[PDB]
Amino acid sequence: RSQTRISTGSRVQTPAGAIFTVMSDVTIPAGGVATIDIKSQEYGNIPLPVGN
Amino acid sequence: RSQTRISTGSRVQTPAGAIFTVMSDVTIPAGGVATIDIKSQEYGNIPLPVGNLIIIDGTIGWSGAKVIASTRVDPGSRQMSDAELKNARVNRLAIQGRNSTMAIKAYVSAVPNVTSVNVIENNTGAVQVVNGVSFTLPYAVWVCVAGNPDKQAVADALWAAHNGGTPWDYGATNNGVPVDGPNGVPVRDPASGRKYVVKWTTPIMYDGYVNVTVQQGSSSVAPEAIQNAVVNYAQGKVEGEEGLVVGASLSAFEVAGAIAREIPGIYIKLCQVACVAAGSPAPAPGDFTSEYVMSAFGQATISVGNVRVTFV
Amino acid sequence: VISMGAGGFHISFPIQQGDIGWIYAADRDTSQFLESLSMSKPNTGRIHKFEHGLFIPDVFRRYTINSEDSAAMVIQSTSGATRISIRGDNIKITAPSNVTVDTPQANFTGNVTIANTLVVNGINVNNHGHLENNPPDARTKGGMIA
Amino acid sequence: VISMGAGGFHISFPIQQGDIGWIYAADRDTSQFLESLSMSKPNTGRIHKFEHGLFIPDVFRRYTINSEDSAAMVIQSTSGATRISIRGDNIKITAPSNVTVDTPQANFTGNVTIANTLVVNGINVNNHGHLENNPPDARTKGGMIA
């Protein structure tokens, strides 16, 4: 509830994710919000179907 | 997850260890990572596997421990001139000479952590001719070492200092315990061949007893001086005399000489020396005698409590 | 948040969103301490700031105090509906709805008094009559007579 | 060590070796004040140092909270073995071993309920039969029937 998501919030997938967030967001009363991802490296990598 | 452990992180073992960290590490997402260490001072107590006390760590570092998988070594220090004036005669490291008898002792004694070595050769065609061991296989030799470090170092040193066909020999059931059952498999050779034979033993840890009667001297002398002198001789810190090694017989005259060398001005009247087996109950009062004789594979040390003096 | 207590005996209040109080400022950085609760370095050089502090709950003057315990210690709610009034020489426990004792062994050391009906072991005490021998197994007439 | 309380009613925790908390620093020297607990002159000129301070106990996050009282005041141990849960409108008292009331005069003002055997003045209540006139002094058959 009412959480202030920040930039560079790093999410790491099990196969070496190391993924930032692209733009800031604020949590809504629903409890689910949309955030964007950019890879910390410049190679071709794939995200797993589930959150890690 | 995703934490970097930087170098020279002071890790402290519970008996004041103060270990370091060699190479910087990044913790994998698995959460199980192995870091290499290094001790601070030349004098390092052998540690035990516990949760190492944290001194310097990052915001994320949680804990460190010692699992069985880690492989350990031992340090080296305390090399005083006394050891040099003793090891001059024995440690004649004739690197120039390999196929010999005096060469094997010296080349083995170069291995770290090794205290003393014996090598006795038969030279004849019959069994039971050397001072203290049987043979079985003739034309061979047997090797005994003390304070032994890990196998590979002494195995390489031993194989690198012989030349004969089959000079390796286990003595008999009456000898020191063999280190390995069939052999020691010295894998590599300069010929790259797969040759494998090394046989050597370790001594039997005996125990000695000393009791001496003296005069009171010029002034008051506490018994602790005599106890420290005899213990120091037994360990071998005095110049010249190597003390007690693998294959040295305790002598009452020699102990009295050591006492006189350390503390003069005292009149020794009686001297007694006895030897006791490993873990055996303390020898009876009638056990002591003037002279004791030890065989080749018998090592004996003396503690503070095994020397008791009651002046007249 | 501060929760007073030591020797394994603490006190906590069910804080929620919108509660007020006071905040203090620590001398140095405490994050490395808050991870392990043991001796640790300061993380950074920041000093005397509210970034790493300590919160103390409070209610200020928002409560009702009942007329009876104007001189006795109270542990209550905001409205005084439930109270534990520890007076100088007596104790009073107030609960308008109900109270419970989850202890499998109670004790008393004096005279006891009830003001209404009793229920024990699933049956009643304010009307109990024991069967006798004559007449055979007949109900003891009536209930609870002094 | 701070022990909250005023008007002759205080709270104390049995602190022992190894307990953690926070320490504050007094403005001036308070040794002469602690020597008599009255108005006193400052002793020395030392200011804002931890030498003469004040300690406040705390437990931080080292406790277990039972799922039932997630919205009520709890006075308990670290493990929650013994509790005093003051909810909005009811009170629950937990003691796995036993509880006692040392008061020599208890009181109640409503319906009471027990779930097991009763012992009063050294004798049972859940099986009792009173002697009668005929048959002469014979025991009342049975125990406690509704």
Numbering used by the authors:
A (entry chain v): 106 to 157
B (entry chain s): 106 to 417
C (entry chain F), D (entry chain n): 76 to 221
The authors write:
Bacteriophage E217 infects Pseudomonas aeruginosa and is part of an experimental phage cocktail developed to eradicate P. aeruginosa infections in Galleria mellonella (wax moth) larvae and vertebrate models. E217 is a PB1-like Myoviridae of the Pbunavirus genus characterized by a ~66.2 kbp genome, significantly smaller than the classical enterobacteria phage T4 (~169 kbp).
We built a complete atomic model of all factors in the extended baseplate, which consists of 11 unique proteins repeated in 66 copies. The total mass of the baseplate is 1.4 MDa excluding six trimeric tail fibers emanating at the wedges of the baseplate. We deciphered the complete architecture of the E217 baseplate that we rationalized as two complexes, an idle cap complex that seals the distal end of the tail tube and a mobile complex, the nut, which attaches to the cap via adaptor factors, gp33, and gp34. First, the baseplate cap formed by gp36, gp37/gp38, gp41, and gp43 assembles onto the repetitive tail tube, sealing the genome-ejection channel. The symmetry fallout from the sixfold tail tube to the trimeric tail tip is transmitted through the heterodimeric gp37/gp38 complex, which also recruits the adaptors gp33 and gp34. The third subcomplex in the E217 baseplate, or nut, is built by six copies of the triplex complex that assemble at the bottom of the baseplate surrounding the cap complex. Notably, gp44-a and gp44-b are the same protein but in drastically distinct conformations, with the conformer gp44-a being globular and gp44-b extended, like beads-on-a-string. In the extended tail, gp44-a and gp44-b make a handshaking contact at the baseplate rim.
